Symmetry: D2
Subunit: 205 residues, 4 copies
């Protein structure tokens, strides 16, 4: 029994399916959003509906079973929503580095010395992921807004109340396979050319 202000939907994306070429093919973006993300949107909504029913009648065997789907689709929708938002065509700023005069920029130089180095780290983490997963540049609000590079598995997302996702990078094969196939190393590097750091600076404050 999912209600109006409970259900989610696919977000409006601020760029064209081909606006990220030649770094990300429109064939991927098409399938990824409209195919993969749509599946998560449907999954979360159906999972919530299934809960009001199972919970509504004290069936914990089902309640516990449905939990997984909610973590998966709910985290999937969240991750991809973050993903599109920190992506932009080179035209609209994509690939433009954080300002040496911005809060986020100064923080990267203090902890990592340069945005360049932070990328080598994030890329190493991404290449490290075994199976499906994500990489994040997170801000920890409980230890003085310190930045860190964290890796989640599958659809898991930054859910800790004190953690705030700054940049999300998809490591699922579906994200890069049609264009890069096995060579995920090329995809990890290339994607920085379309990363919307303006959104990162926005999230940092």
């Amino acid at each position: 029994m999912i209600t109006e202000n409970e259900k989610i939907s696919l977000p409006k994306i601020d760029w064209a399916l081909d606006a990220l070429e030649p770094y990300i093919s429109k064939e991927i973006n098409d399938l990824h959003i409209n195919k993969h993300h749509v599946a998560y949107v449907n999954g979360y909504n159906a999972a919530i509906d299934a809960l009001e029913k199972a919970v509504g009648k004290r069936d914990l065997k089902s309640v516990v079973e449905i939990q997984q789907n909610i973590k998966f689709h709910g985290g999937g929708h969240t991750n991809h929503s973050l993903f599109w938002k920190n992506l932009a065509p080179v035209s609209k700023g994509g690939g433009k580095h954080p300002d040496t005069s911005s809060a986020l920029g100064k923080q990267i130089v203090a902890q990592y010395g340069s945005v360049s180095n932070l990328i080598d780290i994030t890329n190493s983490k991404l290449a490290g992921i075994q199976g499906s997963g994500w990489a994040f540049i997170v801000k920890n609000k409980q230890n003085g807004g310190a930045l860190d590079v964290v890796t989640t598995a599958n659809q898991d997302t930054i859910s800790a109340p004190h953690l705030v996702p700054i940049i999300a990078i998809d490591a699922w094969e579906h994200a890069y396979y049609l264009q890069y196939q096995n060579v995920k190393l090329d995809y990890f590097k290339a994607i920085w050319n379309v990363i919307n750091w303006a959104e990162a600076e926005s999230r940092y404050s």
Copy 2:
């Protein structure tokens, strides 16, 4: 916003806190039910209440965070509820083996040859558990009601719609530490002297 027919409570136990001695001390049973299980009952109820709120306003970061607690307390309540139900004083049948003429009994002799052997297996699994967890004798309804011995971690419980828990055995230290301390091997053996197989036969049908 947890409602009446949604919230759970502590189940009525069919034996006295000392009725399982000298296999399980009343000091343990007291703390375990009234202390550990009570904590799970409170946890599940608060977790559900927290959902109607987070879900009610499309806050997936919280929705995903709360998921874990629901799996934990909800699975904890379920496991312990199963646990008390397959425990009984030697007086009330505890420790009495499955009938060689019952469905469950015949199934144990077909797959394991004897209840004796099934116990050595279950005990080996229990001793195998690293950290907190449970052991189960489950009936798989999708492959001809075949029995199997499975091990879950922490509060995880048999949630698969086709799987049916026949016997639950707690492997958490809290279950046996006050009386057996480190020697979990003694606890695993001794507990069979108070296992209510009558409840197992009940669950098998």
Copy 3:
């Protein structure tokens, strides 16, 4: 310090890269074996070499870190080795069902009633997998050689001494994406047309 009889290598495959069309494209088989499996072969070998070094000098921080890679590449090599072996061109028997007069065949009809039904189950499990993973039809030797359908995550493999993998099915996107993309449901169905049941019957004894 990995030695001769310790190191692994890519197995000789008994069919041509295109012998499984139009169910599995040669473009996939090429990349999968020669690209994905090769990566696992290299991974396991390097992981073992790294151990003799870390273990050789009581560096448990590294020893524990290397453990993961050994589970991953070692399990990856094992899974794919099983995968090729239970695949065959329709010509060489691929897609031919288990004999109603064979041990494995009779076991499928006893537990599942028909090979047909066992496939619907395995397909449901495969579709259930969240993220990367595998599906297996396993024989449990400790409960009377009973068959069951189990799902592992990532490169995890059937390692339990009492469990024996009968059929392995890859659920990683890399296995089916180039040809089926998102529609994994089509891949799961189609792959049965090239499953080598003769190898399954071989493994069952």
Copy 4:
């Protein structure tokens, strides 16, 4: 085939079994070291011996199975070794806070404002742990030696080459049950009265 410089042993502890009272009973310390830690020491050694054998003959099914035990006992030995080292009798400094003039001290005030607050955080994390696990105050060397409070499950330990454990706190029930039973909240608070911050400052450099 475990060799001399490969095998581990129980470390020499710098305090008496009762030197931590009334915060940690000697009954616990006895059982914990000599009972729990000893079990891990034996586990790691046997696990390594079992590897030289399985690996020595390309049996990956066993190699992958043994991996888990090595992660568990190897991580268990590491965690407890860290644990004793950051524990001390109030006499020998236990409970004495980090110097406002030391590197570690200044870092705690910059990120957390006070050691007091860092403890409330660590305690919240510890209380958050579901099942068996540990809590750590770690120094990340790849982002400017920033401090963070992390929680591992079971015997998992800080293995990341860039992470350095500063303080380890055991969250297993065996650590506090005999004296505090269920009330882990009391144990988490009380243990700070015997935490050896001098060792933390040592690890920070």
